[PDB]
């Protein structure tokens, strides 16, 4: 507690982190998909001791007036009190809200979940996809853990095949399932700036002492689908550039783990 900043900063000066990770290393990652078998998709992600579960549940509903040709996606993050003594019961606080929105943006704006492929009857009946993020243990870097889990759960998702019967005019939900139209794999990569040093995948102890933080979310295609400098501090333009570039590299290493987990659950 503040004793910790000095130790962390000084270690950083010696090119070291408290857990012996490099500046660009993630803590060990565990991705396990399809763990909530009742849900349509799910992913348990562990970044070291940070654990987050994401469940995907889908139903059929009306699209938004403005977008009758798009299915619906909605992202909620529950910072459940059990995950952290800083997490209090109640509606999402600004941390949960920013996590949800940045992760949603990463998926939405990359069209990683293609909402256009989620229409059953244009303007009337679309697939509605709830990305429900249950943070189970907060040991730092919720943003990446939540985005990894979110996209891994979407990749894991199998949803009822739905057919609009052209003769009765009814929609029929079949037993056969199909994947969701997941077309990109955006992965947030998040850096803590501590003094003049950025360190990827900050643990809680690093988040406790960081100046500021920046999340770059990128897909397989070399595109950035979200960026969010979060908390205070300031970044130099060259730090951002570094972050973007390093993000793409780390995101790719993470995408491989995601695809592997996703594929393993089909074994």
């Amino acid at each position: 507690a503040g004793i910790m900043r000095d130790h962390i900063i000084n270690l950083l000066k010696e090119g070291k982190r408290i857990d012996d990770r490099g500046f660009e290393d993630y803590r060990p990652i565990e991705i396990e998909v399809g763990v909530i078998e009742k849900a349509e998709g799910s992913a348990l992600v562990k970044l070291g001791s940070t654990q987050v579960l994401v469940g995907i549940k889908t139903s059929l509903g009306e699209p938004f007036p403005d977008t009758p040709n798009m299915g619906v996606m909605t992202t909620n993050v529950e910072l459940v009190p059990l995950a952290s003594p800083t997490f209090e019961p109640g509606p999402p606080d600004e941390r949960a809200i920013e996590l949800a929105r940045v992760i949603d943006r990463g998926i939405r704006e990359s069209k990683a979940l293609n909402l256009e492929k989620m229409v059953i009857v244009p303007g009337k009946i679309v697939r509605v996809v709830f990305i429900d993020v249950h943070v189970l243990d907060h040991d730092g870097n919720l943003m990446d853990a939540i985005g990894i889990a979110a996209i891994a759960a979407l990749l894991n998702a199998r949803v009822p095949k739905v057919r609009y019967n052209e003769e009765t005019g009814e929609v029929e939900t079949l037993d056969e399932t199909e994947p969701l139209p997941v077309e990109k794999i955006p992965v947030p990569v998040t850096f803590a700036k501590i003094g003049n040093i950025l360190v990827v995948d900050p643990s809680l102890d690093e988040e406790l002492v960081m100046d500021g933080k920046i999340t770059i979310t990128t897909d397989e295609t070399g595109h950035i689908s979200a960026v969010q400098k979060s908390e205070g501090g300031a970044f130099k333009l060259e730090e951002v550039m570094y972050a973007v570039e390093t993000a793409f590299k780390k995101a790719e290493e993470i995408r491989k783990l995601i695809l592997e987990a996703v594929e393993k659950a089909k074994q």
């Binding site: 763990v35 909530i36 078998e37 009742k38 849900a39 799910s42 001791s49 654990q51 579960l53 994401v54 469940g55 995907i56 549940k57 139903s59 909620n76 529950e78 459940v80 009190p81 059990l82 995950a83 952290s84 003594p85 019961p89 509606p91 709830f130 429900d132 249950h134 189970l136 243990d137 907060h138 040991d139």
Partner: protein, 236 residues
């Protein structure tokens, strides 16, 4: 129908058979104590904090800790996505789970403090409250919280005119009664008892006695989960 064939249940369980139960203690880094339980298709995590400073002060009791319980279902834990928020049911379950755990706790050991118990139901399939109390006890013990006993819990119920042990969702859905009980097994002290349904006195009592036998077998499993943990620390 038929939830009771001859004399087997839909998953092949006999009338007095429990669903498969796995429990593990110490699964969370932040919580002072934690337990995870997979009880049938229930997947439930329980955390405890601490005994810890209780603010607002007004809430503090001078002679004892208070126990606070929150039972919560994750949105994706049920067939129809559950809006996050608590709801009347989860608030009542939190209440009876507190009333289930409190007697096991030697609360005067930590005056002015809170012991906060959190039960997150990650997948629900009937019996979440009894599986929650069971993981909760484990989490309390995992937290090093001095206790008079564990609390073990199990539901018995009535399906197709017959008293059975440990309903699943289907059975509870189409069932005639659900009777969760929690007990402190050592003294046979019933800390939770509910009955949702319609039973004769005799039916109800046999359900309770059955549920207790179920709770006692769950209790064996808790102790074994605790032994497991004490074998882990015995290393090296």
């Amino acid at each position: 129908k038929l939830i009771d064939e001859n004399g087997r249940r839909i998953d092949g369980r006999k009338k007095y058979e429990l669903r498969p139960i796995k429990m593990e203690v110490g699964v969370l880094k932040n919580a002072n104590g934690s337990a995870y339980i997979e009880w049938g298709k229930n997947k439930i995590i329980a955390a405890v904090y601490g005994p810890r400073e209780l603010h607002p002060k007004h809430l503090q009791r001078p002679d004892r800790a208070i126990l606070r319980v929150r039972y919560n279902m994750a949105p994706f834990s049920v067939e129809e996505r559950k809006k996050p928020g608590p709801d009347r049911r989860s608030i009542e379950i939190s209440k009876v789970i507190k009333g289930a755990l409190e007697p096991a706790l030697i609360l005067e050991m930590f005056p002015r403090t809170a012991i906060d118990v959190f039960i997150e139901v990650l997948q629900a399939d009937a019996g979440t409250r009894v599986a929650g109390i069971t993981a909760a006890s484990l989490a309390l013990a995992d937290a090093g919280i001095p206790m008079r006993d564990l609390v073990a819990a199990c539901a018995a119920g009535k399906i197709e005119g017959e008293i059975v042990l440990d309903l699943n969702k289907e059975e509870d859905n189409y069932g005639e009664a659900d009777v969760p009980v929690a007990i402190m097994p050592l003294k046979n002290d019933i800390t939770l008892l509910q009955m949702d349904g319609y039973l004769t006195k005799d039916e109800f009592i046999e359900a309770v006695k059955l549920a207790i036998k179920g709770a006692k077998a769950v209790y064996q499993k808790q102790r074994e989960a605790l032994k497991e943990k004490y074998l882990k620390i015995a290393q090296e």
